[PDB]
C-alpha cells in the first residue's frame, strides 16, 4: 500500500529507573631486554 | 593582631614628615597606591621596580614590604597551627588563612622548583639506569606487552 | 603638495572622482587600497586607479602610475587621503583605490567621461 | 664573575637521558607509531551531515515508527536513517523489528535481507517466504545471497514450483 | 485535537536514497454545540528547521 | 661553483650588480648543507673514539671544533683552555665525564686525518659563508637600507633575488611579498614566513606578525626604489611598531542600586526574553515534595 | 607507546597558576590530570620493585 500522509507523535517517553525491561538480569609483541 | 596597620601607618607618617609642604597633596595618595602595588607584586611573586622611584622612598618601601611579609607569614603559620589544634574561629579566618596557606604553599613549590632545576635531577645516572633495568627485568619476565596507540578502528 | 605626485586633477575633477569612485563603490565596481588597487592593475581588469598626494611617503604609491604605464590605464591623484578614504566608503583614510570595469556597467560612461578627462591632465 | 645555575642542571638531566636511551636501546618489545603516518590515515577517514538534522531524522523516523508499527515505509525509512549513519547493526536491529511488526511486507523483507548479512539473509528470506510466498523479489533476493551454482538452482526451482507465472 | 499537527510522507526512491517531507498540519477545534470547526493550519515550515524536539 | 663565487666576493669586497649578492647569498645557503653533511660525516666517523661526544655537543661547529681540539686522544679534556673557549665550563665538565667512561675504541691515523681534514673543510666553509653574508650584508647596505634594516639583509638579498632587484618588488603588493618564497611543509609561508623577525613570535601569532612585516616590507622596498630613504628611519620605526604589536598581542565602584518598575508592558518581546531564561519548563512535579510517600530510597538525597 | 608516553610527561610540565601566581611544575607530577592516577600506580610499582625484588 501507498499509506500517503503518516503522523508523528514526539514525546518524552522510554523513562525508567535505568534498568532493563527484560525480567532477566540485564546481560552487561612484549619487552625483551638484550 | 593589627601589626601590619600600625606599620603602613607608621611608615606614612615617616615618609610624609619628610615631604615637600606644597607637592604632598597628591604624592601621598601615589605613594600609598606604590605601597600597596609592592605588597601585591611580593604576594605574587613577581618583580616589582619603579622607574621613577627615587631609591630612599624605594628602599624605604622595600623594608616596609619585608617587615609586612615577616609578619604575614609569621601570622599566618599561627593562624594555621591554631585552626589544625581545634581552636574556635570564624570563617574570615578560616579563609585569609587559606589565602595566605595558598600563596606560602606556591612560594614554596616555585623555591623546589627552582632548587631542582638549579641542582639538577635529584636522582643519580646510575641510579636511574638500575631503576630502569629493575623494571626492564620485571615487565620481561611478565611478558608484558606495551600498550599501543589508540587503534583509529579501535572497536571499544 | 608632493612635486611627485602627477598628474594633479583640480578641484572639479577631484570632485567628479570623488563621485565615481562612491558610485563604483556603492556598486562593488571599486577597490580600496594599495594592494587591492595593484593586483586590479595586474590582472589588468582596472579602469581607473587613484592615487593620494597626502600620503607619507608617496613612494609606496609610486609604483601605482608606473604600473599604469605597463597596462595603459589613466592615473590621478587626489588632494588628501581622507577624502578618498571618506568616497570610498571607509573611517579610514585610503590612499590608492582602483576603480574596476564590470560587464555592462551603468556607470561606464561616467567611467570613460573620467578616463578622458584624466588623460589630459597629465601633460 | 657570575654562573648560570640552569647549564649544569640541564647538563646532567642530558646525560641521564642519554645513559637511559643507551639501556633502553636493550629493550626490543617496545612500540612506536609513526605521528604523521596516522594521522594522515586519520585524514583520510574522515567521511553523514548536520548532527542535529540526522538527530531530528532518527527522532521523527522512531515517532513514526511509535505510531505506526505495521507501516514498512515507516520501518524502510527508519532502517535507511539508521544504516545512513551510525552502526549497522542498530539498522539491522530495526529492520528485524519492522519485519516482526509489518508481516506481509516485501519491501521491508528486502531491507531486512540488504541490511542483514547473508547467513542471516538466508533466513530472512526464508521467514519472508514463509511469511508471505509466491514473491518473484524475495526469491530473486535468495537466488542472488546464495553464492553457489547447485544453491541458485534449487532456489530457482523452489521458485518455479512456487510461483510458475513468472517470467 | 492536535494528533494531526505534525504529519510528514516517506518518499522512497529506488536507487540511492528515500525521503521523509513534513507536510502541512491541521488542528481542528471543533464545537459540538453549534458545529464549528477552527482548523488551525501549521505550515511545514514551522517544523523544518526549528532544532527543537517535541517539548 | 664556491671557488668562482668565492673569487667574485673577494673581487667585490676589494673595490670597497645587483645578481652577485643573490649568488652569494645561495652559494652561502649551499655551503650551510655542505657543512651540516659534513658535520653529519665527521659524527658518523668519529662515532667509535666518542659515542657521546654527539650528545654533549648538539651544535655542528661545536661538535666540529670538539673533534679538531680532542680526537681521538680523550686526555684533551683535563685543564683545555682551547675547549673552554669553544664550550662553556659545564659542557666541558659533561665532556670530561663522557670522556671518563666512553667504553670507544680509538681510531687509526687515516680515520683521524681524514676527520681533521673534513673538520678544517667544514671550518673553512664557514669563514667563506661568514665572510659572504657579510659581503651580502654591506651589499644590502649599500642597496636597500630600509630593507635591510627591518626584516634583515639576507632576508631582504633573498626577496631582491626572488623578485627581481627593488625595481621589480616595489611594484609588487604585500599579498605577493608575504607569499614570495613559498613551494608536509606549512603552506602560504615565503621567505618572510622563515626570517629572523618572524621567528622571535609564537606560532599561534607567526603568520599575523608575518603578514604585518610583508607590507611593512613592500612599502621599504617601494622607500628604497628610488634614491630616498638612505638613513633608515622609516624601517627603524616599522621595527618599533611591530615590537609594540607584538608586546600587545602577547602577555569599577558597584553601581547604586535602585528598583524601577519591573514591568510597564508585556507580551511582544518580553516572551522571546523569558524563553531564553525562565522558558516554559515542567512547572509541576520538579519543585513539588510530595507530602505524604517517599520517591526513590528514603535517605538518597 | 613513545607518542602517549610523551603527551604524559609533556601535560605535567606546563604551567600551575593561582590568581597571581604562577610557575612551572618541572619536578612534580600534578595530580590534577585524569591519567596521573596511572601514573602514581605505575610508578608506585617500580617501587614495589625496589623494596620486594624481582625474585620475591
New interface residues.
Partial sequence: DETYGVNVQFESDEEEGDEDVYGEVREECTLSAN | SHFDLELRAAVMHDILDMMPEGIKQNKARTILQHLSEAWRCWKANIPWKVPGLPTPIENMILRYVKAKADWWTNTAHYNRERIRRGATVDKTVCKKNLGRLTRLYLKAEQERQHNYLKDGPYITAEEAVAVYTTTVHWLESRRFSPIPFPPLSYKH | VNPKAYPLADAHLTKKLLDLVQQSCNYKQLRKGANEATKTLNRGISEFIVMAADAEPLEIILHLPLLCEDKNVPYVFVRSKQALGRACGVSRPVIACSVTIKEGSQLKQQIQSIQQSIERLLV | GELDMRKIGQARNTLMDMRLSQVSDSVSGQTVVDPKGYLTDLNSMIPGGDINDIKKARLLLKSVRETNPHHPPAWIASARLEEVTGKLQVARNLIMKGTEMCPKSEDVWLEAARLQPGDTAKAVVAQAVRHLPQSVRIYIRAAELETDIRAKKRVLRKALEHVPNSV | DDTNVYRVTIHKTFEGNLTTKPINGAIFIFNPRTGQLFLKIIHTSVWAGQKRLGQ | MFAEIMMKIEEYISKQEYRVIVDANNLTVEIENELNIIHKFIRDKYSKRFP?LE??VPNALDYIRTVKELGNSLDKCKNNENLQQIL????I??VS??ASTTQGQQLSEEELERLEEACDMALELNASKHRIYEYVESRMSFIAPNLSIIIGASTAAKIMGVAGGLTNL??????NIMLLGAQ?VLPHTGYIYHSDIVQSLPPDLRRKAARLVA?KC??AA??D??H??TEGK?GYELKDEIERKFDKWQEKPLPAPLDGQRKKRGGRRYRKMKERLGLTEIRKQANRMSFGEIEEDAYQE | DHNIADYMTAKNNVVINYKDMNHTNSYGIIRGLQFASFIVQYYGLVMDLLVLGLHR
Fill in positions: 657521546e650528545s654533549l662553556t665550563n659545564a659542557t665538565m659533561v665525564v663522557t616595489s611594484k609588487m603588493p604585500a599579498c608536509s607590507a613592500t612599502l617601494r622607500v626604489s628610488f630616498e630613504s622609516v
